[PDB]
Design a protein around this nucleic acid. Structure first.
Ligand SMILES: [Zn+2]
Lengths: 123, 38, 47, 134, 74, 52, 52, 121
RNA sequence: GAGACCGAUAGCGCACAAGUAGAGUGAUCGAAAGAUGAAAAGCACUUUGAAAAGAGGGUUAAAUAGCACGUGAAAUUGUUGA
RNA sequence: UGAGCCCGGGUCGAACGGCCUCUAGUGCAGAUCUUGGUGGUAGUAGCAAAUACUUCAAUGAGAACUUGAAGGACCGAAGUG
RNA sequence: AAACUUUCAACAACGGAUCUCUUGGUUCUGGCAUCGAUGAAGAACGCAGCGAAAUGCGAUAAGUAAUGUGAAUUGCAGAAUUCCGUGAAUCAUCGAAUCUUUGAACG
């Protein structure tokens, strides 16, 4: 169904994952980190986060996080490397890129127009 | 232990027989409400 | 002798004997604070 | 209005009986009407449906279409009419469950038992018609 | 352990010293039963099992305990 | 063992040197019948047992 | 039914425990254990002034 | 592999035993050859099992009919042939003993039995 | 056979494989749990993915009904807008 | 005036309402109320001791805790047999 | 200015309230009287082509005989039924049987 219903489905690409076993708070923080970016920039950034070359800022769910110079890229002090959330977002972004390839859209001019993380039923 | 009786052995076999899963064709029967073993 | 136990922390909402090893114990609450104040005001009124 | 104390107007009991009826009671329930030509031929209104009957579907999405009964599936109170099928996703055709009250019988599968059933129904109807007339 | 299996009622409740079932009292002919436990009474009352023969009695009563075969049966 | 030997003799005409029995965990009995040297186990299994 | 709400074994935990002074079902191996009973405000309990 | 109840009723004891033996032998052999490629052979085995049950029922029924004819005019019958009814009904007084009445009551009823009468409005 | 009764936190503890799962050495204690759709017609085929699944496509009056299934509140949460 | 009543837009799919009487298991913010669900605390407290691990290669989508070889340690017959 | 905290809205989540339904419960009324040594109630183990529970049955084992009905069962697989017939059926009735180990339980 998707939250952003104002986008026509013939001109965009989409991806979804449900009941994903990963931290909701960290996943939200890294989604906000990659929100509004171009696809290649987001993919490279997520790989760098996995490699601990760049870190995502922790904005809201940031209790007792160490300070790192990498956070200066965001104008913040609390940065962290959510490896698992980064891998999950890489999987969904690659699925969305594959859907764009199938639909015939240009992959070099795609931006992350909408990204959302919600809470799944607790286990 | 190693020392037991054929009756208790048969009871353990029956316990396993209850501790088997459920059949897919049972699941596919019409009017069926059985989903998983309880 | 009788040790008084507050029903807070690990002792809040427990069925019976807490971890306190003793002959006789007594659970207390603020509800019991008000009961105790009522009993003493009745006693003072009687006296 | 009911008079005999044996019968009950209980919705609960009526639905329980309908949905837990055995196969013979289900057959009697899935009785179906006869066509007009058969009506003035046999003096019979309705008869239980069976596998060899030719029926005409006159209710449902299938407007006025004929066919031989393929199977009387007594378990869910439906019958299968030949060539009245829908394709699944895979393209395999599955029969559509149709109800005997929605079908009407055009050609009737004949044997000794059904000839006897028709004779009994006709005998009762004509006896009562004669009694009412004179 | 003070309780093994009882052959009459099937519960792991026969004392191994007293040799008496704490649930039914197996060595005694009667089945243990008390009126202060309606839940136990309704746990082990008639109808909680198989009804081997008492389930078949009522139809024979209905037909009147009649014996024989139908006339003309092969 | 006596009943098993008698059954294999009378029904399927099999002579057995000895029989060893066990009870499987499920509750059925398994019998190993070691036959006489004259007869051939492969031939008997192919003929009377329908086993390859 | 006159037996409705009373087919249970419940006893109040006490006064000094930081829980409501209500009868609670004994046991310890089910959801029903520790839950309130015997009251008109409790789930699966007796109704106020049962109909006669 | 279906045996007919009417044919079994027509047949006598020796033929019934012969058919039972043939069915048992066939069932054993076909089970042995069934354990591999159990199929329509399984259907056939179900058929012979039901047929064996039917033949056994017919043999038992004929034997019981013969025994009842033998004990037709005897005071004590086997407990299997005695009617079941209920334990209380079996313990109950017979119809003759329940209807038996004293001679003086019989005389009183003979000479003063309930009369038929009516009272005018 | 009935009712100016109750309507899934109600009504018997049990509308369901409930005196069941489970707890206790034992006497005993003892739950939670109903609803797709008229009909499974319960998604063929293509593509991404190790897979779970996703995206096209399709069934249906409806998938804003996908067997986490009638309708789908609040508490609480995410995204966007101010 | 008010408790409330009525309409529009969206969702939904099978029953419901006004008026006059009758009837009651009829109106909630509390009861350390009952049942269920959900938050802040919080990605916080925390995930112990048994000295110890390392290189190459293999399987696998993925290898610190899966394997083979090589090292470096240990139980030390009152054993980690 | 962004971020963060908070307010409102749209959509999407969590959760299962409301409305609707009900092969269930509860209460009342009416006809009738029927467990067991001819082995009861209860407990156990077996039995289906593919079944664990529930249900049915007892080595004749999801059953046999008989009577009636009259063309099925159904999730799949395999056989039927000649339909002008002693005859399908997880059918109904039911007068005949089979009825493992125990349990008043009885070498
Ligand atoms: Zn006992």
């Amino acid at each position: 169904r998707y939250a952003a219903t104002e986008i026509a489905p013939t001109k965009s690409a989409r991806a979804r994952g449900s009941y994903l076993r990963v931290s909701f708070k960290n996943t939200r923080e890294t989604a906000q980190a990659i929100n509004g970016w171009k696809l290649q920039r987001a993919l490279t950034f997520l790989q760098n986060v996995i490699d601990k070359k760049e870190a995502v800022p922790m904005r809201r769910y940031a209790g007792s996080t160490g300070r790192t110079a990498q956070g200066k890229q965001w104008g913040v002090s609390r940065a962290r490397w959510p490896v698992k959330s980064a891998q999950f977002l890489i999987g969904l972004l690659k699925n969305a890129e594959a859907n764009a390839d199938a639909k015939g859209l240009d992959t070099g001019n795609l931006i992350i127009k909408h990204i959302q993380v919600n809470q799944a039923p607790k286990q | 232990p190693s020392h037991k009786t054929f009756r208790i052995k048969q009871k353990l076999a029956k316990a396993q027989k209850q501790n088997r899963p459920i059949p897919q064709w049972i699941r596919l029967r019409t009017g069926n409400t059985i989903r998983y073993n309880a | 002798q009788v040790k008084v136990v507050k029903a807070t922390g690990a002792n809040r909402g427990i069925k019976g004997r807490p971890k306190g090893v003793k002959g006789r114990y007594k659970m207390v609450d603020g509800r019991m604070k008000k009961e105790m104040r009522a009993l003493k005001r009745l006693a003072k009124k009687k006296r | 209005m009911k008079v005999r104390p044996t019968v009950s107007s209980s919705r609960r009991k009526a639905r329980k009986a309908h949905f837990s009826a055995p196969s013979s009671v289900r057959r009697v329930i899935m009785s179906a009407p006869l066509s007009k030509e058969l009506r003035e031929k046999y003096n019979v209104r309705s008869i239980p449906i069976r596998k060899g009957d030719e029926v005409q579907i006159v209710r449902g999405a299938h407007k006025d279409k004929e066919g031989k009964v393929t199977s009387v599936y007594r378990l869910k109170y439906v019958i299968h009419v030949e060539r009245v099928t829908r394709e699944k996703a895979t393209g395999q055709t599955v029969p559509i469950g149709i109800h005997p009250s929605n079908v009407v019988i055009t050609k009737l599968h004949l044997d000794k038992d059904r000839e006897n059933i028709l004779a009994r129904i006709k005998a009762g109807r004509e006896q009562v018609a004669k009694a009412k007339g004179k | 352990k003070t309780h093994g299996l009882c052959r009459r009622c099937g519960r792991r409740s026969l004392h191994n010293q007293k040799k008496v079932c704490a649930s039914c009292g197996y060595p005694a002919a009667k089945t243990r039963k008390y009126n202060w436990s309606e839940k136990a009474k309704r746990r082990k009352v008639t109808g909680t099992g198989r009804m081997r023969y008492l389930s078949t009695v009522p139809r024979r009563f209905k037909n009147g305990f009649r014996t024989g075969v139908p006339k003309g049966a092969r | 063992k006596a009943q098993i030997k008698q059954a294999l003799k009378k029904l399927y005409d099999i002579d057995t040197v000895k029989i060893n029995t066990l009870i499987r965990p499920d509750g059925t009995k398994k019998a190993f019948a070691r036959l006489t040297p004259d007869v051939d186990a492969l031939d008997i299994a192919a003929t009377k047992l329908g086993l390859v | 039914s006159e037996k409705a709400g009373h087919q249970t074994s419940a006893e109040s935990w006490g006064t000094g425990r930081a829980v409501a002074r209500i009868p609670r079902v004994s046991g310890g191996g089910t959801h029903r254990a520790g839950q309130g009973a015997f009251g008109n405000m409790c789930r699966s309990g007796r109704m106020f002034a049962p109909t006669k | 592999g279906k045996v007919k109840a009417g044919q079994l009723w027509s047949k006598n004891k020796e033929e019934l035993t012969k058919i039972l033996g043939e069915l048992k032998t066939e069932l054993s052999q076909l089970r042995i050859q069934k354990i591999s490629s159990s199929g329509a052979k399984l259907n056939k085995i179900h058929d012979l099992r039901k047929s064996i049950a039917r033949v056994l029922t017919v043999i038992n029924a004929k034997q019981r009919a013969q025994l009842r004819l033998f004990y037709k005019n005897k005071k004590y019958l086997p407990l299997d042939l005695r009617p079941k009814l209920t334990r209380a009904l079996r313990r109950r007084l017979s119809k003759e003993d329940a209807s038996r009445v004293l001679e003086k009551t019989k005389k009183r009823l003979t000479h003063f039995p309930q009369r038929k009468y009516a009272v005018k409005a």
